[PDB]
Design a protein around this ligand. Structure first.
Ligand SMILES: NC(=O)C[C@H](NC(=O)c1c[nH]c(-c2cnn(CCN3CCOCC3)c2)c1-c1ccc(Cl)cc1F)c1ccc(F)c(Cl)c1
Length: 300
């Protein structure tokens, strides 16, 4: 089950402005982005703020700590730059930023690169120099997904951008997956064998359609660290998500649970030990105009 364990809000603020979350490499600590562009560190059990940093002059939309604890990616709403890389050892400082990329992720196997998304276009950057290594855009193969988000595969040799599979080393598009929806561009399963693009599960080897999973329609997904469970939440047609998230067995795509929290969801994350789930939820009735979010901690 998902037993509520604890809840907290942005300390001392009339209106709590948490917008996104990620567990730190440091156990017992959660990182939260806010609607004023700050990064907060919270002790996740006491619900007490420990540190605060200034990152952007607009709402943080998403963040991602590096596994080793040394680096953090942030993205914002209206800032220039829209995304940035921060060092977290000794002094919290901006290392590099990514002009107009509104989404960024680390590479997966070795976290030496950043992949940023601007619309239908992917940009790959070197973490050391900040230099743009690659622009990935193929006018013949584009799907023009409205919520595109480029991503590396588990071994970093492939990228999926706009439903197109790229060989990174050669910088060539090797396959376009056919379009079935307007918005969602897809992710790699952690198993290395499958691509999940909205409701379609494709085999990487053959490019054959393996499964259709209707419940994944319009969902962002994240897997637990062991890659046994997949969490999905449907984007809203303001909070990025509706009031529900769903779990699925990552091995067979069979559903496990649907959780309706009856509040708009902003973000969800799990810890490295897959002990806990943190969900950012707006308080009030559904689609409240008032912004007053909490972070709920659930025991998986
Ligand atoms: N942290 C994670 O990776 C877990 C993952 N969260 C998200 O994907 C987001 C959280 N806020 C967002 C978010 C908030 N605002 N925006 C839009 C920001 N604009 C983009 C265009 O330029 C202006 C700013 C995305 C997104 C988001 C939405 C869509 C796209 Cl394509 C890309 C994303 F990162 C998630 C997975 C499964 C779940 F069940 C739930 Cl509830 C959440």
């Amino acid at each position: 089950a998902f037993r509520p364990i604890s809840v907290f809000r942005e300390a001392n603020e009339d209106e709590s402005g948490f917008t996104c979350c990620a567990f730190s490499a440091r156990e017992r600590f959660l990182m939260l982005g806010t609607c004023t562009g700050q990064l907060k560190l919270y002790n996740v059990f006491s619900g007490q703020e420990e540190a605060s940093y200034n990152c952007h002059n607009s709402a943080i939309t998403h963040l991602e700590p590096s596994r080793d604890g040394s680096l953090l990616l942030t993205s914002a709403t209206w800032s220039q730059p829209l995304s940035a890389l921060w060092g977290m050892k000794s002094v919290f400082d901006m290392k590099h930023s990514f002009t107009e990329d509104h989404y960024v992720e680390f590479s997966k196997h070795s976290q030496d690169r950043v992949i940023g998304t601007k619309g239908d276009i992917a940009h790959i950057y070197d973490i050391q120099t900040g230099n743009k290594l690659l622009t990935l855009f193929n006018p013949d193969l584009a799907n023009n997904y409205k919520r595109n988000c480029a991503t590396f595969n588990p071994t970093d040799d492939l990228v999926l951008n706009d439903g197109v599979l790229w060989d990174v080393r050669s910088a060539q598009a090797i396959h376009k997956f056919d379009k079935f929806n307007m918005n969602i561009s897809g992710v790699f399963h952690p198993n290395g064998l499958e691509v999940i693009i909205n409701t379609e599960i494709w085999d990487l080897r053959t490019f054959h359609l393996l499964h259709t999973v209707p419940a994944l329609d319009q969902c962002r997904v994240v897997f637990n660290h062991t890659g046994t469970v997949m969490y999905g939440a449907m984007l809203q047609a303001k909070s990025p998500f509706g009031s529900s998230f769903r779990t699925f067995n990552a091995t067979d795509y069979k559903p496990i649970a649907t959780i309706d929290v009856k509040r708009n969801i902003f973000d969800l994350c799990t810890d490295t030990k897959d002990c806990y789930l943190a969900v950012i939820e707006n308080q009030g009735s559904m689609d409240a105009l008032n912004m007053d979010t909490v972070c709920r901690l659930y025991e998986v």
